[PDB]
Each structure stands twice: as C-alpha cells, then as structure tokens.
C-alpha cells in the first residue's frame, strides 16, 4: 500500500531539534556528533540542514555546505529514521539536495565526504578517492589519565623506551597557521592529498578555508615551523551519546605528515593541553594518521600510555563526485 501523504523536504528549524534526535538512535556507534551540533549548523551562512517529512513528521536529513570558495559542497549527517529505511527515502533526499545545490550555487564543481566504510565497486565508479588515513581508537578516564601520566612519563624516560621530542607552537592569531598551511611544499609533503581534513571535514588549504577553520577554536602543534613535516589538529571536545549518561566526549585529533616519533609526541601534547579541561568527565579519542604510523601509535597509546583501544584498524576515506546537469 502506498504512502497516504507525500514526502516534503523543508529547510531544517530548531522546533524539529527533538524529532531529529529521535530518528539518530545508534548512529556513528554512540560517535555521532550531530546531537551537540545542530543548533551551530542552523547557524551557518553556507549550509543548508534539508528535511525529508512525511504528514509533517521528521523521516530523515542531510547537510549540505558550500566551502572552498564557492566550488565544492559537502554532504554531511545524511540518516533516515530506522522505521523507513528501505524505502528510496535517503536516495531521493540527495537528489533534492543536490537539485538544490545546482539551483543555488551554480559554482559548485564537485561533491565531498568523508567516510569509514569499507568501499566497494560501486563507491569506486561513483567518487574519486582523494586521500585517506589511518583510524586509531581508544578511551580514557580525564581524571584518571591526569592522575598517572607522570608517573607514566617518568618510567618511560628512565627506561630509555620514550622522552618527549621537542615540538613547536603554532599560533593562528600570530600568522603561524596560514604560513604552514598556504605553503605548497606542506601541502605536498606533510597534508594528505594536499587537504586539511578537521574532524572528518575536508578543506583545500585556502585562505578563505583559513577563516572558516579559525572560527571553531581549533589547536595546532608543529615539530618545526622553519622545516614542517608533521603538523597535528586538536578539534575542542564535544558531548556524544554514547554511554548514556551526559560524561563521555569525542576528542579528534588528525595528523597530517609520516614521522611517527613525532606523532606521537604531538598527541601527547594535545592530551595535555585537553584533558585539564575535562575533570569528571571520559573521552573516546580518535586519531587520524597516515595509515602506515598506525600499528606504532596503537602500541604507543595501549602499552607506552596505557589506554584502551576500542577497534581494530579502520580507514577515513576522503571521496569527490563531479556534479553533472
């Protein structure tokens, strides 16, 4: 039997918040970020937050947000209520999505989005894959990571198994960013596929990119602002539902260059500028890195820090899809 009313696809409104948290229930496996972010993306001047409804009921969304100065959108949040899936709901919510964006962004060139699943044949006739990384996994307790890092610390060293390397400060009022990222030697050598990739959003090292990126409060560290070859991403921690009880945080750090000693002196930094601020509260921690650095910082967090790893190796996959009329 068909449906008694029909689909409408809306622009996203705060009054739908609660009927789109009820339709996200296990998604990104207790990840999933768009329940803190929600009302931020309403605010943005370049996305749209589209709605699929049916008999005015919220059955499914998808973001899409214009970046890179106007030439590339970015497919995000893309889910449909558990109770209709099956059902070409998604399917025909990107078609409207991407009528949309070729209606209202004529320089939009190419689609983006990043992803973790395995990809099959038919990713790979549909999208391009740009770059991807390595994904490293694993918990922690803030206070109790505090609580015994120097002790940690302190062994190692007199161990000779691991000491801190020198790393160097980046700042973005101070300019330190923009010459780093605006440099085509970094971009070649250090970014993956010459792209920022921020907490699964990719960018092009741009400018206009550049304003976008200092707006969200990010943390940079370098092991040499003279000679880059790692530069590493600290995006503030956000409230996941995982665990059901408000106290679990989702800190993404993503590595950008192939010196693993410098990886992991890099993530050790980021922990400790981060874990003070989260007191009482537990972390998933997720690293991206150039796949090849996995297996030695998986060793580095699990025996060298202690911290529990949650999942074997994945993959963040950065794919591109040309818009066709």
Same mark, same amino acid.
């Not at 679990?248 to 980021?270: C, M």
């Given at each position: 039997?068909?449906? &008694?009313?029909?689909?409408?696809?809306?622009?996203?409104?705060?009054?739908?918040?609660?009927?789109?948290?009820?339709?996200?229930?296990?998604?990104?496996?207790?990840?999933?970020?768009?329940?803190?972010?929600?009302?931020? /993306?309403?605010?943005?001047?370049?996305?749209?937050?589209?709605? &699929?409804?049916?008999?005015?009921?919220?059955?499914?969304?998808?973001?899409?947000?214009?970046?890179?100065?106007?030439?590339?959108?970015?497919?995000?949040?893309?889910?449909?209520?558990? /109770?209709?899936?099956?059902?070409?709901?998604?399917?025909?919510?990107?078609?409207?999505?991407?009528?949309?964006?070729?209606?209202?962004?004529?320089?939009?060139?190419?689609?983006?989005?990043?992803?973790?699943?395995?990809?099959?044949?038919?990713?790979?006739?549909?999208?391009?894959?740009?770059?991807?990384?390595?994904?490293?996994?694993?918990?922690?307790?803030?206070?109790?990571?505090?609580?015994?890092?120097?002790?940690?610390?302190? &062994?190692?060293?007199?161990?000779?198994?691991?000491?801190?390397?020198?790393?160097?400060?980046?700042?973005?009022?101070?300019?330190?960013?923009?010459?780093?990222?605006?440099?085509?030697?970094?971009?070649?050598?250090?970014?993956?596929?010459?792209?920022?990739?921020?907490? /699964?959003?990719?960018?092009?090292?741009?400018?206009?990119?550049?304003?976008?990126? &200092?707006?969200?409060?990010?943390?940079?560290?370098?092991?040499?602002?003279?000679?880059?070859?790692?530069?590493?991403?600290?995006?503030?921690?956000?409230?996941?539902?995982?665990?059901?009880?408000?106290? /679990?945080?989702?800190?993404?750090?993503?590595?950008?260059?192939?010196?693993?000693?410098?990886?992991?002196?890099?993530?050790?930094?980021?922990?400790?500028?981060?874990?003070?601020?989260?007191?009482?509260?537990?972390?998933?921690?997720?690293?991206?890195?150039?796949?090849?650095?996995?297996?030695?910082?998986?060793?580095?967090?699990?025996?060298?820090?202690?911290?529990?790893?949650?999942?074997?190796?994945?993959?963040?996959?950065?794919?591109?899809?040309?818009?066709?009329?």
């Amino acid at each position: 039997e068909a449906e &008694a009313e029909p689909l409408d696809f809306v622009v996203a409104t705060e009054r739908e918040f609660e009927e789109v948290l009820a339709i996200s229930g296990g998604i990104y496996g207790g990840l999933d970020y768009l329940p803190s972010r929600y009302h931020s /993306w309403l605010r943005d001047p370049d996305r749209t937050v589209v709605l &699929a409804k049916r008999n005015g009921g919220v059955i499914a969304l998808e973001s899409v947000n214009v970046i890179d100065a106007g030439e590339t959108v970015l497919v995000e949040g893309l889910r449909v209520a558990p /109770w209709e899936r099956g059902k070409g709901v998604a399917g025909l919510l990107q078609r409207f999505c991407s009528q949309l964006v070729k209606r209202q962004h004529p320089g939009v060139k190419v689609a983006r989005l990043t992803r973790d699943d395995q990809l099959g044949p038919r990713e790979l006739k549909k999208y391009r894959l740009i770059t991807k990384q390595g994904i490293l996994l694993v918990r922690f307790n803030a206070s109790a990571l505090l609580a015994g890092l120097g002790a940690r610390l302190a &062994a190692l060293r007199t161990s000779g198994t691991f000491s801190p390397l020198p790393t160097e400060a980046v700042s973005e009022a101070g300019g330190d960013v923009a010459r780093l990222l605006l440099s085509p030697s970094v971009q070649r050598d250090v970014l993956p596929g010459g792209t920022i990739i921020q907490d /699964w959003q990719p960018y092009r090292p741009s400018e206009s990119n550049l304003r976008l990126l &200092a707006a969200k409060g990010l943390e940079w560290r370098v092991d040499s602002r003279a000679r880059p070859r790692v530069l590493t991403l600290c995006t503030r921690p956000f409230p996941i539902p995982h665990g059901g009880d408000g106290t /679990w945080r989702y800190l993404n750090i993503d590595a950008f260059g192939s010196d693993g000693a410098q990886v992991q002196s890099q993530l050790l930094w980021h922990l400790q500028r981060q874990a003070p601020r989260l007191v009482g509260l537990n972390v998933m921690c997720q690293l991206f890195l150039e796949p090849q650095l996995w297996s030695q910082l998986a060793d580095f967090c699990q025996v060298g820090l202690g911290l529990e790893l949650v999942k074997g190796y994945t993959e963040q996959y950065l794919l591109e899809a040309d818009i066709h009329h």
